[PDB]
Input
Amino acid sequence: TIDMRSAYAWSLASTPFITSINDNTFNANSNTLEYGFKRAKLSWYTID
Amino acid sequence: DIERPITTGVPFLLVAADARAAGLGDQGVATSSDVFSQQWNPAKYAFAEDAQGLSISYTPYLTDLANDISLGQVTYYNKINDRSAFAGSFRYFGFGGIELRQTGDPNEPTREVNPNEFALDGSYSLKLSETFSMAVAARYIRSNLKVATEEIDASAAGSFAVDVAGFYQSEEIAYSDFNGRWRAGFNIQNLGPKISYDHDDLSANFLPANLRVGGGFDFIFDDYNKLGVSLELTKLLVPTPPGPGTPSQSQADEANYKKYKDIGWVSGIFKSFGDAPGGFSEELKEITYSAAAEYMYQDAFAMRLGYYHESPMKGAKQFFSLGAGFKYSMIKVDVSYLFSASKVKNPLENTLRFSLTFNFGDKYETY
Amino acid sequence: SFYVSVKDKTIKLNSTEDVMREVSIFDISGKLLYNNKKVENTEFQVSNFQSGNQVLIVKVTLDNGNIITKKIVFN
Amino acid sequence: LPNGGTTNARWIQFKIPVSQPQNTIGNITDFRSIRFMRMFMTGFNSQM
Amino acid sequence: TYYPGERGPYNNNPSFGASNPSANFGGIMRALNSTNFEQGNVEYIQFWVLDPYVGNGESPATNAGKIYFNLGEISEDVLKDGRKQYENGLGPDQVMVNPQPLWGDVPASQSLIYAFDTNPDNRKNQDVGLDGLPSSREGSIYTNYAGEADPAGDDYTYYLNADGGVLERYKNYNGTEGNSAVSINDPNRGST
Output
């Protein structure tokens, strides 16, 4: 196995496509500020 | 193989830390008094012939694989009177310095860690009668094996424990073909609060509370040749964790582990005598025993042979031991070797123990 | 001359000038966790190995036959 | 529990076969160059 | 910990509270050390997750959703402008992209080493998040939230420097602005 749960190894993701490259569910295809409009708050961490 | 082993914290405390006792099948509770008589029976420090002594012992681990992985012990005793003695010891298990080299640059400043476990104890032994002595020991245990990472808390876990020991040594009694001497001893060890490795009361491990009882007899020939035969019995004072079940499927196991882990160490001592569905015959199965023989020539040469037998269901650490001792003027040198007779590999296989003790001061007559 | 580094569950072996022939990685119990008879490099990366058990012993057999032992912490 | 009470818990194991994707985005046909891994959460109405 | 109803970093949606929180996303990505899955014979993604609908702090049963996983080549352009942000190249004396590229300041120089110097003033000028703005010029770009203290929503807060429960103390732990304070004794301790 290759461990993938190191919190510091993860960073904020780019906006994803959901079905294909022509899908715009989260505005991944837009070239304006709308590209980030569907990004909600997400926190990733390992409790100290 | 090993079924339902007894889980205790800091198991390094049970390892024989001196070559003399290791050569006698990891037993010292009823042998002759020596400088290493702190792990086994502090009560016989009051029977020491020399006024004071200092010893250094080396027990390496994984010798073929790496160096500097060893269990080291330094003991000092000093009997001020002919009836009382003060002793202190320092057992230390460490892997040596380990370099935490993250990048590949040769000159990058590297953090070095030395994961280790040590126990510092001091004992006072008082000779009540001319043939009987008792001792009380206080031990501080510190475990620092964890290495700090971004997630791992490497804070050292510590605990305290007390030992109560007694030693009996009869006078030289004459027989038909020889004039022997009888020895006996007991040592209740590691009596203290649970050690919390993760600094949480909900997850605490029993200290390796242990009861050693033993008897020894010395065959004396020609006032210069001595043969000593000793037997030791050992039982952990920690309750056995449940196995199959004793109230769904995993719910019963979880409840049993809940009940087992919610036991105080004082209560665990008494739950050790039992906590099983079997009778006396099946609870004697948890008793570790060890037999040893020691031949002494001019009190300056010793040949040591011993057999150690744990239950195959608990640990299954059984082996034969050979030891030799040499005393030049005040320097005694002890070496021991282990021949394993068990299915499970013994980490001390193919390992030569070394002990070196310095005796100095006045001489006390033996009774 | 010989360096062992661990960055993220990966072990990097750097033996300058000399060529490593074999690497064996041991947990501290005598247990072999990884062995590679076919390294043949002055730098080797154990990327197909991951244990997480902290202290490891790396033993490297050089082409000359010399054996280099390094103790590491598997971060 | 640290507060002295008790609670239930349910650990769920997932095994997602890499060779059987639900969808393909862009022009990728093999698994010989997998350079990034992204996970994102969606569809939830409240804090999760 | 996912807050679908709370604005993510660099989100300038004028009507975010009026939108359905189920239509939002929150995601993280990561680089892989071994990229040849075929040679390595990578077979599946395995994980153990606590059921979030069972225990004490259980989620309401109506709070259903999906977790997606992506493997392959994924855009590293988090703030998509065609340009690579790197905050160790920012600063008042540094050259910026001559027209500001739609998310804030981007250094015009070629990056060499991904590292800060240890000067506190340079750190304060540089550790301003992925948008390249020190929270005082963010309102110019993120106009719909210019009245807030952190218009871009990227400010970092140390978990011991915040208040509330464990989850609340980590809510801003992933902020890219102010997460690299020079002093480890800083009240807002870095985390990187």
